[PDB]
């Protein structure tokens, strides 16, 4: 097509239909990294999450008011 001066303009996203020669080489290199990150989110997520309606049973709360009454 045309000339868009991508010779010196080197943004983080490339710009103007930029695709590196070794794009296949880096493609899996990110899938490997990205998949590990999600596994981290699932390991972190399940370890720390909780149900706010089950931490305190009903009997314990039914006495808190009698203390503050």
């Amino acid at each position: 097509h045309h000339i868009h001066t991508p010779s010196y303009i080197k943004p983080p996203t490339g710009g103007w239909n930029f695709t590196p020669a070794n794009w296949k080489q880096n493609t899996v290199l990110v899938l490997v990294g990205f998949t590990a990150c999600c596994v981290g989110l699932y390991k972190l997520g399940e370890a720390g999450s909780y149900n706010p309606k089950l931490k305190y049973k009903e009997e314990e709360l039914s006495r808190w008011n009698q203390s503050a009454k």
């Binding site: 868009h4 996203t13 710009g15 794009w23 990150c37 997520g45 999450s49 149900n51």
Partner: protein, 642 residues
């Protein structure tokens, strides 16, 4: 399974943003779509547990504010209302991402468009998952930052760079009031947590409750494009079609309604605000339906369609029927997202890439798949019985008469006009583009075809959800006695019984009877009797047409009389204060006075024995005069300076 549903789009957004140059273009679009897909699956898993098995999740990351009693944590709860907002947002956004892969195939900047597009999805997920009002504000602001980039995406187009600024600033006006409302929440209650604040609704004063929620309402007006702050909604078409396919369906537009729904425990005990909410919806529904009938742009009409359909969610809030509005929000995220994508395929299919509907005509045979998606969406938008629109839109209008109040009755006609107008401009859009004699050059038709499979897959998935989804999800939200305590409905405000029993038969069919009759009557006039619709004859009908076509002149009143006036106030301060009196009472003024006085003084220093002799003799009068007369000599001495 909670932390995966929230932060996965953020990881996908960053990968294309910074690693995008290293992973090409095509391999950078599908990774972003991959990150969203993970979140779509994780949401349904949560939806299975939350709605059905009544399990709630909460992941508290770390504290954020610890200033005396005010404690705010970076926490993200996922309760029933939160998941009922994740279904429209996360599902549609994946389809928008899937749609954008083949829509933006020719755009030179694809590694950047999907970086902001997913960042938008994450910014919305934080909004509908924060467990305190401040985390909601972190998401609330970042819809505007994400939209500002996306609406002004083509930063080389003047009408689009300015349109981003207009969308950013009007939202900040809403965000200016939201901050003020949040402050009164800390003042009155001491915290901005949902649990703490909502537990006090029945014990807090009405005036203090009214002040907070009026601020929320002004914040919501900007986002839901209601009356008085709706100029940005139509100006947002300057962005790419996927942006409009996402912002106006399950995103930035709807974010005003969610804020008011979340505040149901506070909103109930202030009848005055619920009246204001109801009246904004009726006017916005009435006005938008009228503007849409004389607009001549395919994306303006659909954009005005959302404002009318969002207003329907506002009137449902005003009758304390929060369940109805939430259910209609989910339905509208599918038969309005489908419209934009299909319309975005009509513009793509034609090789001239026109957007004015007056340059279309006779496309039904050439692109029958894109027509079928619009037609099914249009009937659903018209609330034809059997479709998703019927199970959500009609019942809201049913309950306008179902409250049996004066305000409720007035808005019923405004809804009923907009219920018919929805049936009138929908037919106009399809007829002008699919059942009309050709207008475009004949060379276009011999190249007018359909698009690839990637652009087609999302529209078919949304097409099915635009028929069956409303029926399957009705009893979850609109069921009788379904436990939905996340949205509070005060016992005195439960008018769902009277709505479904005391309405005469005529009302239950009236929107359809005028919708079907009005559409066909207009359809005949458009086809056989088009001489009437040349409005340049009747000056009254020309002035009327030119009035609604310019959108009630509100764009002209906002630009020429408020922004133009607002900028002039800044010019007055710059001229008469900053460079004005404060320069006369400053360096420029004091230079004149110093030059005046120092000019008088330099005359006195001159070698003369007689001159210095008189002043010495003159000073001897100080001793003679009674010292009560020093102030007069001081006054005289200043007089001689002149």
């Amino acid at each position: 399974m909670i932390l995966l549903c929230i932060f996965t789009p953020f990881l996908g957004s960053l990968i294309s943003g910074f690693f995008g140059r290293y992973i090409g273009v095509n391999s950078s679009k599908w990774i972003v779509c991959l990150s969203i897909f993970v979140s779509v699956v994780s949401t349904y898993i949560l939806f299975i547990d939350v709605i059905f098995n009544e399990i709630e999740y909460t992941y508290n990351i770390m504290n954020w504010l610890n200033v005396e009693y005010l404690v705010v944590d970076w926490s993200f709860t996922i309760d029933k209302l939160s998941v009922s907002m994740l279904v429209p947002v996360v599902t549609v956004s994946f389809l928008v991402h899937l749609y954008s892969v083949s829509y933006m195939s020719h755009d030179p900047h694809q590694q950047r468009f999907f970086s902001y597009l997913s960042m938008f999805t994450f910014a919305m997920i934080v909004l509908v998952t924060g467990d305190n009002y401040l985390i909601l504000f972190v998401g609330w602001e970042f819809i505007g930052v994400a939209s500002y980039l996306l609406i002004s995406f083509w930063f080389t187009r003047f009408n689009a760079v300015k349109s981003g600024l207009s969308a950013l600033l009007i939202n900040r006006f809403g965000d200016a009031l939201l901050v003020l409302g949040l402050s009164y929440l800390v003042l009155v209650t001491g915290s901005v947590n949902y649990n703490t604040v909502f537990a006090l609704g029945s014990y807090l004063d009405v005036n203090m409750i009214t002040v907070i929620l009026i601020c929320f309402l002004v914040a919501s007006m900007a986002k839901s494009a209601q009356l008085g702050l709706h100029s940005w909604l139509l100006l947002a078409m300057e962005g790419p079609t996927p942006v409009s396919s996402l912002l106006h369906a399950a995103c930035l537009v709807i974010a005003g309604v969610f804020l008011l729904m979340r505040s149901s425990p506070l909103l109930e005990y202030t009848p005055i605000v619920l009246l204001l909410i109801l009246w904004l919806g009726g006017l916005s529904t009435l006005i938008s339906g009228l503007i849409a009938m004389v607009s001549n742009d395919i994306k303006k009409i659909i954009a005005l369609s959302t404002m009318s359909q969002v207003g329907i969610m506002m009137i449902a809030i005003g009758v304390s029927c929060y369940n109805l509005a939430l259910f209609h929000l989910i339905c509208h995220s599918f038969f309005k997202a489908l419209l934009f994508m299909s319309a975005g395929s009509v513009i793509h299919s034609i090789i001239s890439e026109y957007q004015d509907i007056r340059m279309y005509g006779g496309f039904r045979q050439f692109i029958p798949l894109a027509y079928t998606c619009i037609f099914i969406a249009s009937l659903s938008l018209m609330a034809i019985p059997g479709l998703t629109g019927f199970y959500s839109k009609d019942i809201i209008i049913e309950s306008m008469y179902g409250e049996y109040t004066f305000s409720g009755f007035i808005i019923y006609w405004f809804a009923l006009i907009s219920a018919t107008c929805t049936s009138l401009y929908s037919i106009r859009l399809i007829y002008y583009t699919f059942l009309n004699n050709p207008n475009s050059p004949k060379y276009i038709y011999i190249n007018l075809k359909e698009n690839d499979i990637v652009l087609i897959t999302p529209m078919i998935i949304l097409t099915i959800l635009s028929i069956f989804g409303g029926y399957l999800l009705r009893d979850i939200y609109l069921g009788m006695g379904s436990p939905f305590n996340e949205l509070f409905i005060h016992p005195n405000n439960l008018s769902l019984i009277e709505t479904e029993f005391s309405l005469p038969s005529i009302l239950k069919v009236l929107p359809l009877i005028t919708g079907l009759g009005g559409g066909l009557i207009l359809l005949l006039i458009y086809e056989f009797n088009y001489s009437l619709f040349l409005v340049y004859n009747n000056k009254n009908l020309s002035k009327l047409y030119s009035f609604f076509n310019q959108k009630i002149m509100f764009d002209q009143l906002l630009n020429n009389l408020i922004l133009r006036s607002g900028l002039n106030i800044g010019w007055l301060l710059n001229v008469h204060i900053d460079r004005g009196i404060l320069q006369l009472f400053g360096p420029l003024g004091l230079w004149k006075l110093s030059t005046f006085i120092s000019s008088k003084l330099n005359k006195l220093v001159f070698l003369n024995i007689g001159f210095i002799l008189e002043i010495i003799v003159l000073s001897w009068l100080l001793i003679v005069f009674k010292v009560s007369l020093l102030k007069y000599i001081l006054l005289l001495i200043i007089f001689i300076i002149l």
